[PDB]
Amino acid sequence: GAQVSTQKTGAHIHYTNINYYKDAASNSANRQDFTQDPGKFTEPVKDIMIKSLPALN
Amino acid sequence: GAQVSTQKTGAHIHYTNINYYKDAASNSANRQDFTQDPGKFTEPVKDIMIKSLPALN
Amino acid sequence: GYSDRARSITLGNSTITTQECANVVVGYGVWPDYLKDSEATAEDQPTQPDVATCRFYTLDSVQWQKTSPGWWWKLPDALSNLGLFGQNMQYHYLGRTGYTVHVQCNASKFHQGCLLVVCVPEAEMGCATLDNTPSSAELLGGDSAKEFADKPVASGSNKLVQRVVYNAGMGVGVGNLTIFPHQWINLRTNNSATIVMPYTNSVPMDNMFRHNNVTLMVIPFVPLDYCPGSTTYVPITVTIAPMCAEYNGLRLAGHQ
Amino acid sequence: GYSDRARSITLGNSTITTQECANVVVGYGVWPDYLKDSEATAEDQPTQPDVATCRFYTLDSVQWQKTSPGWWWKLPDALSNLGLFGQNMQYHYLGRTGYTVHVQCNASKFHQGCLLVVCVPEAEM
Amino acid sequence: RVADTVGTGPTNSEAIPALTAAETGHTSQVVPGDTMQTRHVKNYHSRSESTIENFLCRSACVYFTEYENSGAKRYAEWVLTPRQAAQLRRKLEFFTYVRFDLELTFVITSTQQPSTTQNQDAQILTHQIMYVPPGGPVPDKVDSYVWQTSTNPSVFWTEGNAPPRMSIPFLSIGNAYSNFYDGWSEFSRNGVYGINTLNNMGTLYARHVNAGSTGPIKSTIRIYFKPKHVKAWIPRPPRLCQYEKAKNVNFQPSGVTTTRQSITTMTNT
Amino acid sequence: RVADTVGTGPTNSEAIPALTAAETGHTSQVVPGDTMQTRHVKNYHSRSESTIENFLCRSACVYFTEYENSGAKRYAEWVLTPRQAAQLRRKLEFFTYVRFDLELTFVITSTQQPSTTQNQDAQILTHQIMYVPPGGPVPDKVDSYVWQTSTNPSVFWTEGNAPPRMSIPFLSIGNAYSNFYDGWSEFSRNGVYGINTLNNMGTLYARHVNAGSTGPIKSTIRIYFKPKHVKAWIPRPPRLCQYEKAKNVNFQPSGVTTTRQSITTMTNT
Amino acid sequence: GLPTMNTPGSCQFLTSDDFQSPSAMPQYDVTPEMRIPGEVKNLMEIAEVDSVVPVQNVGEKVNSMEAYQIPVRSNEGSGTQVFGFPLQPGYSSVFSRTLLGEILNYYTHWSGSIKLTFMFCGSAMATGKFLLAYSPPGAGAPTKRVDAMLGTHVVWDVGLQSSCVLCIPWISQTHYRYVTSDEYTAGGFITCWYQTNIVVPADAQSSCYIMCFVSACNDFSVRLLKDTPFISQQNFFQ
Amino acid sequence: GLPTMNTPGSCQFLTSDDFQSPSAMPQYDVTPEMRIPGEVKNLMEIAEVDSVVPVQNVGEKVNSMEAYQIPVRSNEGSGTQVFGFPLQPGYSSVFSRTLLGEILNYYTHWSGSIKLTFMFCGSAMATGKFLLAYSPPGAGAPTKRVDAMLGTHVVWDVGLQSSCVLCIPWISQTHYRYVTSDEYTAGGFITCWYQTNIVVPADAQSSCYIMCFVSACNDFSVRLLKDTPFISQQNFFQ
């Protein structure tokens, strides 16, 4: 039950992982979660605002 | 995800490798890169020079 | 049917013709080009003067004597006050360019001597005083050649440069300078020397007033020698053409 | 949904925004261009600085008083000492260009007055 | 992958990206090519080190304390909390609610204390670390029967080995931990303010199992927290002021920022 | 595989491989069989140990420094740099620009210092090594709060174990490191010459976590660099002269080479 | 026993290692997850939000709301300066305490473009035009409006839309710049000038204020996580 | 726990081990690669480039450019010697500081053929013929041109092409030779003689110089990487 994942590499390879314990709080940190969604804190308006259009008309 | 490569041997066998970490700066040194291209430092002339021909004519 | 000795180079509104040339040395096999989209970091649109900046500029002449140690020129500094190349590096914060360097020295058959012409990247030099660092005035001569010394320089709390010729000012063997792009002016065979250098740096562009990417060195390995009645005044002339020059970061003129 | 009063003009590294503009007048209906091969006479290759020369230059300001007669500026002379436009006309024997001229004057509703802004060809005095 | 610059030319139109209304509460989303001419620049940069995990997942000293093999202080105790130190507290309080597992490490060291005792030869020291969950019996002495650790977790460790390390999961009765609590534990609204039982994680006890020597020795334990598997909600403004207490948010009023010489000065005074 | 000799016989022609022009800047590519008769010799030799990797990928002592468990020097500091030593500096400066990951090793040792103190029994010593990236707070004392290492990397190590070892990637803001810099950090051209911020790698701090004993002890740390995953550009002439400083290339003029008795002497005088 | 060899680094504590360890509570059932608003996954979602800049941080203004106000008035002239500060996002005291600056002071490096938003807060009658300018390094800072006119600028006209945004692009020789002070990685200068004078009618205030907000563009990123020089400690907090 | 047995060599630091270690900066994004000219992948691409030999390394000539000049003139005779040195690429002071010699002094062994290029630097009118000779070991060095004529030689005639190359082949009993001095792995002798006299007209200089360059052939290789006896240190450089 081995997991093969990709390593952090430069721009312009794999590693193997096996879990030994039974609790899942014993596992290693999730360092490869690169999900973003800034539209909650930024631009949180009810009506959408187009960039080229005047904010108030 | 094991990698089988050839060992340094004499003239006139394999080894196995697995990566454990996630960064790829943690990997071992690349000791088997035998690529050569001396024509940059040597013979760097615009017009090609044949060996049997006179250098200047 | 032609002669490999005769070559003509045309750039902008200038053209150089030599009837006695060894060939052309091309950098590291790399012809100069412009920076590509996948290698850039600065985001504003660059300016490319072309014919206005890429053209031959001819500097002052030096005299080859029987006891001359040699001369050096920082390429960016050499053309810093010359035409629109100078103006464009004055008004911009970043620049990028390659070069075509042509060295000229003629003499008759009787005249003998050999010069090494070499383009050295990052020619960082050392001060005569070990604690201090060489002064800018001592390291750079914009419109004039800088001269090597034959005897060692005396270190007395000054900011001079160890301009020893057999150490090439960089504390290294002078005979080993052949790794760098180079050509030899041998009076019996050669007349001129030509090197085409590409842009060489660890960054995609750079400021052209606080950094000199390349230095031109002319060093006589065999002295100049003639019998009496031959011409005694023999000059050397240097002509340099920027290539694929581009500029970013427009602002008020000046360096501070 | 927008207002014809608000306009933005971007040239080189400069950008001008006005919230109260009548519109844009275009010469004689002719947008500026480069010289074509079938209209040229000089044979050497031209230089085109683009972003370096084509960009907004802002001059000194004048004061509108209650008794002011008016002001004039020769376009080529006005920018003869300004940046790379000035340098390029200094090192060259022939030049060719068009213009975008933007005049600015704001005041409150109470302030009254009217100015004519005109580009006159060959204003020989 | 971070965004890539788009190339643009000159414009003359009624499109006005540079003009907006900040009263709306909306951050403008203008690119550089909206107000200047730009080239095309592919960008290979990555925001991998700015993830909440990487930002929080490093071990940090949160507390250290001493005990001796002889004399009044024979054992040490500490209520687990990350508010005693400054650095991890300030990083954690970027958010209102967090949820993480913990990785716990200990660094135990010993030093010989000055005395007139002679012929002192010391045996190796073993230490016991015991975690008591909130509600259980606590040790009144070094030899207390509670050290039997029938149910309470314990870690025995001998000097010279690797540091001990264990994993602790999310133990909150509530869905998420709380860095801030605007209220009281009493419905009357009397009593201590900003205090609740959501982030109570029990107490830690430490002792020598043997005394080792006939001369005096003093041990110190240092505790290290590493948050794992992190989730966080509601971003908060960073702590401008110097922390004063562990239990509350009290502070001393401080200037918004540093002062320069004038509004046109390009240096820091 | 290295090239193999080709067999040749006698010749009489207008082909002239031995005659050329070195003024062209071109190295002649003549084989032995161009100027003599040769047999066929298959060559099994390999240039495997001449690769830039094998040439550079060995650990090298770059610095060592001391600290004590008592007295004025309680901790050590060092700005990371490979120019302090001679050997790795000279190997690295075969090139103008390099790009590599680093493998870092430490050898920490301790020695008992002379004193009149009596009944000294020493406990085991643990050491802390802390790396501060350029810009961060630095420790003014052994007990400074910055040793909390909330974000800064730290390595704890107890005497008697294996040496500590860690991997560091390429950290340059520029695309490649620079061994040589012909310029100034000031646009005015005033200030120090040959100095830039491209190869700044931060500072290293070292201390005892415990004092261990009632008598004086002094520790030394030795740092070892091993370059990995190497890339290099622009070959440069080797350093003929003896290094004088760490920060610049200053030197004392020296003879091109050694001197013999005459131009026909077959021995070294 | 399978034969093994222990390598250097065994039994060491590196505070940034990533290993599996035994759980001290086996089979513990955690509290399920509920859906909470405002979840964060990257510190660059916080950096991309505006926050008010204290430009007038001079003397006792810092202990007041006056640090955030930029004063403007009606002059008997034109072309005088309004403000100026350098492009130092994490080191300059103008930026170091803003939401972007606080986040930057945890990292050695930074890269990307920046957005400065300026909002007019005078009477509706008050009219004005302003020049907002950025100069890349190499010369000094501009001392006159004409010198500033030669760099990257916007001419802001005040009207119905009260907010104007000045984007500072990434114009650098390196891909990254140090957050700490450094002359090699210099950023440039940011200035403001009066394009035209402030004009008001009778019975309106001729003195006004302007506000500034700083946010990051979508090409911004940071590197090399480190400790902050902003929080300190002398004893354990209680 | 899986049962294991630790073998000799555990927990030792061998400075030439090749192992994987934990990174102290997790998930750090490095600066991308740009294309730079002149990339090296093997030190034998540098050894294969010419460099000027200091043959006249006698007395104070070393502190001058005169070490690199080989003097020749017009004689009232023929067959006299021009120079001689042994085939010791890394040990002889004639070679030990050349680009090939510097590279060789990092390795215990060497193998392959060598290229010596000689360039005439007199007047165009000056004419001459020279004998360039190599003797494998076993006898002494030749003391006369006729003795040298019996080994591996080239007769160089000076004319339009000013450069002549003398290839020294690998003639050895072993596959490799020690870079350090050793009589078992002796290399031989390299000499030059006047085949015909230098002849000039009136008003031309009868004294000339010759230059020498040393480069490696395509069958050259080295072995056993070691420390150089060229750089030293007494205290930490500052």
Place this chain on the structure above:
Amino acid sequence: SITTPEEMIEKTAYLPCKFTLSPEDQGPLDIEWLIIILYSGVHFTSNDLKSGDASINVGTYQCKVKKAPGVANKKIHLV
């Protein structure tokens, strides 16, 4: 790093001690002159000496500039 850390001033005598601070340097700034004057958190010529001018206005005079971890010195022979 101090500019020209070795020089001889032959002659009011102005002794220059202009210095630069590395990104690594972050400790408190301390300036000391020797033969006389000390700066901690003869007369200094610059009010903003913190920016980088430790020059003073008046044997061998030594300027010591210390910001942890960097340490720099400059010796001047006043004749």
